[PDB]
Design a protein around this nucleic acid. Structure first.
Ligand code: NA
Ligand code: NA
Ligand code: NA
Ligand code: NA
Ligand code: NA
Ligand code: NA
Length: 327
DNA sequence: CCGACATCGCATCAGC
DNA sequence: GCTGATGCGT
DNA sequence: GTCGG
């Protein structure tokens, strides 16, 4: 992990441009183009001396190379400086930090004069359920979660799930499963022997129980297979109350469980790489299954998977411990 | 030059 | 009432 | 915005 002081000015620049493309210009692909350029440069173990040097990295093109040259020569970007001072654009960009408020809602709000969290408060009836919760926990949702709190959160989830039905299988994935010292949220993958690709209250009972012991505090969305909400650890005697945290609970069919555990454990860089390796081996891996590719390139039928190991075996790859899946 | 860039559950809008 | 499209986070 | 058919 190269020092950020190496090319941090550049990575921050690209990241900022990324947000404006996504939130203001509504160009998701340019958003990702910038992110990809920011990521490949954040990994470059050398201080970039010119745009041409960066141009050699995959993801960096002529336009970004030109912007780097300007930033290296002036310590800033004219277009960025200008958009930063634009009241409309800066307001739209900012509002998207509220969970539930995307580019469209942000633009809609700003057009009608609603530009700050204060404006949002005075106009609660103009917000949907999700957005109201995002506003209520604006601060908490941007805070990170120390691993110690994740362990405590896991303790509660695993205990309550087993209490509902000892046959449930629950796995907390995400970077937490890879040993991360902090997490941005909690992702729980749930399954049950009675639930398979071929045969609906399993998820509900679990959410209900977590609400019963006051762990889950709010609901953003809830269907038969996916729950997205808010949780909070119990407060310690006469001590500071814990921040509210984002938690997702997915119910997955037994036969697709381990592909799910693999996919949601990542990391993204690892998933991308494992998918790559899978392909050159005649296999395609998504969050649901692993399928063999046949001559023409069409994916056949899902292969039986009884664990993460099975997936690794198919692609003739040694099982990799989650801690070693940073890439 | 120009199409791909991930997919899809859930909440809610658009429209019959 | 419904189906399908869109927004959002994923 | 970048890559690549
Ligand atoms: Na390049
Ligand atoms: Na948002
Ligand atoms: Na956001
Ligand atoms: Na039991
Ligand atoms: Na999906
Ligand atoms: Na329709």
């Amino acid at each position: 992990a190269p020092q950020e002081t190496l090319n941090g000015g550049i990575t921050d620049m690209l990241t900022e441009l990324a947000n404006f493309e996504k939130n203001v210009s509504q160009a998701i692909h340019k958003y990702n183009a910038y992110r990809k350029a920011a990521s490949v440069i954040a990994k470059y173990p050398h201080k970039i001396k010119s745009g041409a040097e960066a141009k050699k990295l995959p993801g960096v093109g002529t336009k970004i190379a030109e912007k780097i040259d300007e930033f290296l020569a002036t310590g800033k970007l004219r277009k960025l400086e200008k958009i930063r001072q634009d009241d409309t654009s800066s307001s739209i960009n900012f509002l998207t930090r509220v969970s539930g408020i995307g580019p469209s809602a942000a633009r809609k709000f700003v057009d009608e004069g609603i530009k700050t969290l204060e404006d949002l408060r005075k106009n609660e009836d103009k917000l949907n359920h999700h957005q109201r919760i995002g506003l209520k926990y604006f601060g908490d949702f941007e805070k990170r979660i120390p691993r110690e709190e994740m362990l405590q959160m896991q303790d509660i989830v695993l205990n309550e799930v087993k209490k509902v039905d000892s046959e449930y299988i629950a796995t907390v994935c995400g970077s937490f499963r890879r040993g991360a010292e902090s997490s941005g949220d909690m992702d729980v993958l749930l399954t049950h022997p009675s639930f398979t690709s071929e045969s609906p209250k399993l998820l509900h009972q679990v959410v209900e129980q977590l609400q019963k012991v006051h762990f889950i505090t709010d609901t953003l969305s809830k269907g038969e297979t996916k729950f997205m909400g808010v949780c909070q650890l119990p407060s310690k005697n006469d001590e500071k109350e814990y921040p509210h945290r984002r938690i997702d609970i997915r119910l997955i069919p037994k036969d697709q469980y381990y592909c799910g555990v693999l996919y949601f454990t990542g990391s993204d860089i690892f998933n991308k790489n494992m998918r790559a390796h899978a392909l050159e081996k005649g296999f395609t891996i998504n969050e649901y299954t692993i399928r063999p590719l046949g001559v023409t390139g069409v994916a056949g039928e899902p292969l039986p998977v009884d664990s993460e190991k099975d997936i690794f075996d198919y692609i003739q790859w040694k099982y990799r411990e989650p801690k070693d899946r940073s890439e």
